[PDB]
Design a binder for this molecule. Structure first.
Ligand SMILES: *C/C=C(C)/C=C/C=C(C)/C=C/C1=C(C)CCCC1(C)C
Ligand SMILES: *C/C=C(C)/C=C/C=C(C)/C=C/C1=C(C)CCCC1(C)C
Ligand SMILES: *C/C=C(C)/C=C/C=C(C)/C=C/C1=C(C)CCCC1(C)C
Ligand SMILES: CCCCCCCCO[C@@H]1O[C@H](CO)[C@@H](O)[C@H](O)[C@H]1O
Ligand SMILES: CCCCCCCCO[C@@H]1O[C@H](CO)[C@@H](O)[C@H](O)[C@H]1O
Ligand SMILES: CCCCCCCCO[C@@H]1O[C@H](CO)[C@@H](O)[C@H](O)[C@H]1O
Lengths: 222, 222, 222
């Protein structure tokens, strides 16, 4: 169960890395090159991480439960790249882009603290990390989306789709966590491993696909 | 004593974060947005750090003394943001800005090594970190200030005030350290906790105030 | 043996830091300032690292062998600066520069995992890190060199020399590793310490010299 989905994550993220790799090598202009290059490293960072977890690295029993703490070094490096996708397609302001990366790092560090601390101390840091996530939710739903649509007037549904898909996918991460043994213990590690694996595929490979087709939409409108 | 000042640091840095938060949301132009956004994350990074120390996280007895090593992850992330304040208002050269951030990181890493090593080994790394600090002192007192005044001819006292306040506040940090149990043991942890707390408020909330009024001075001169 | 070469590395990297330090202070224009500043921090990062290893810090027996794991925090911070040298002289595209730094960090993290893991698990992460290095080899031998020569038409041998010297020097690092106790145990720690020390001098002090004379060549061609 756990080992199966770890290897599935390796192969899918590897397969993803090859796809974005060749797109970067055969890139149209520089904007396509940047977009293929970002998504490539998002998947390669994920592919090596799942390689480490599949080989039993980065997992240690904490509070009496096998915990893959190394997932947080994946996300700390890959999730800012995923947000750069949004700000790159959107041509976002420097202070608003910095706020998204800063808020993301805050959410992940405090999430790590919640992950490695026992109950009920972890519940405090869970609320701190969710509050940081709800801040990103506002930043993407209001100032980021509004600024991006004004800069891309005849392609507004694209940025509405971008924000929504990112929001619905990322919202499941704190739901899996609080339902995992980290919270109410509704399911065990095997189900937790499959959830994160398929989420990661959706939010990296899947969202990588959505960003490429978004650049196409913004460019076919010119 | 120690717990009181830890919570005071939480509340003040939280109160600071709200102030810079609303200024960023209601920002004048982009330069005010960047300045409010920087100082917001400086305080939010500090607010979560004091939240962790107040909850007993990030403190471990080393060399026979309770040591808040996690203070160094605060400073490593927040102090470069404080220096960006100076370089942003100053419109500093890229190589001089990089030198300030590079020298700052050097000072903090070697300071961490001095913090977590026993005497007299720590004294070596203290001298290494102070030497890096004296390098920043030169960079801010001579090339940074000179370049900034030339770019802002009718607002030279502002940059003189900026450099001086930053220098006098940051100079107290190595003084508290060497007087703390890390050095001559002139005072205990409770006094050490109050010093760093009020220093952090001065150098983050206080210096955040000074940077906003500096941008106002530079802009009212146009 | 080990202690002698550690102190030699301290003094040489210190002597290097002074040379690039004064060149930065007396810099011609900003491009010379950036180049002197980069190489200065490359050597200063190396000088403090060798200071820590010479003082016995950052070395711990793993898998039954004294391992200087702290070498990897040197390289993780200094090697991207060395690659910036190449991209700065070359005026490289943003996506190609990001790919070089991303691939470099990948190689070093997975190399660290190979360093701190036992055999034969380490052999997997060695192959993963070498594959990342061979990717950088392609990036520097084909797209980086081609793009740089087009931007500098009458100075093509300079970029051929830059890429070659970087490639031949960096290729020896995985050779020393696999021949060290980390691999076939062909030599002991003393010889391993001398190799890395003289490699670091070549790839930081030596390559710093080559980059300055390269900027001179590119500029005397104008
Ligand atoms: C590719 C990996 C991705 C997109 C990871 C995203 C992770 C999150 C959105 C984390 C969410 C969490 C919270 C907001 C609550 C605390 C627990 C976390 C860290 C799972
Ligand atoms: C908001 C936090 C700030 C502004 C922290 C500043 C910290 C320093 C200036 C550190 C100074 C130190 C030395 C220069 C000597 C070694 C001990 C240190 C790290 C306290
Ligand atoms: C100044 C330090 C430098 C230039 C270090 C360079 C290090 C490498 C090129 C590392 C190479 C390695 C491999 C590619 C295989 C795995 C073992 C390593 C990390 C030594
Ligand atoms: C993860 C390491 C990078 C952190 C700093 C990112 C700086 C981003 O900078 C911003 O990027 C946007 C597109 O990404 C552009 O639209 C903005 O003009 C630019 O200012
Ligand atoms: C902490 C992560 C950021 C590190 C890299 C900072 C790069 C700064 O870059 C510099 O910024 C200055 C203002 O800040 C500008 O005046 C300069 O033109 C710009 O080159
Ligand atoms: C190690 C911290 C910095 C990582 C981000 C580096 C961003 C580099 O950015 C690139 O730099 C090149 C020269 O270096 C320039 O030729 C490119 O125009 C520029 O886009």
């Amino acid at each position: 169960m756990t080992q199966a989905w770890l290897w599935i994550g390796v192969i899918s993220m590897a397969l993803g890395s090859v796809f974005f790799g060749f797109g970067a090598h055969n890139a149209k202009n520089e904007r396509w090159q940047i977009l293929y290059t970002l998504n490539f490293f998002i998947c390669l960072i994920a592919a090596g991480l799942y390689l480490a977890m599949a080989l039993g690295l980065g997992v240690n029993v904490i509070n009496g439960r096998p915990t893959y703490w190394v997932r947080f070094v994946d996300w700390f490096c890959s999730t800012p790249l995923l947000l750069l996708d949004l700000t790159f397609l959107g041509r976002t302001s420097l202070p608003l882009t910095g706020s998204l990366l800063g808020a993301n790092a805050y959410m992940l560090v405090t999430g790590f603290v919640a992950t490695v601390t026992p109950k009920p101390m972890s519940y405090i840091w869970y609320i701190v990390s969710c509050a940081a996530y709800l801040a990103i939710v506002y930043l993407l739903a209001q100032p980021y989306r509004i600024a991006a649509e004004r800069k891309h007037p005849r392609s507004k549904q694209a940025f509405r789709t971008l924000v929504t898909v990112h929001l619905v996918l990322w919202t499941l991460y704190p739901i899996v966590w609080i339902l995992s043994p980290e919270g109410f213990s509704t399911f065990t590690q095997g189900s937790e491993t499959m959830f994160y694996t398929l989420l990661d595929i959706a939010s990296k490979v899947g969202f990588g696909f959505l960003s490429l087709n978004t650049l196409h939409t913004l460019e076919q409108a010119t």
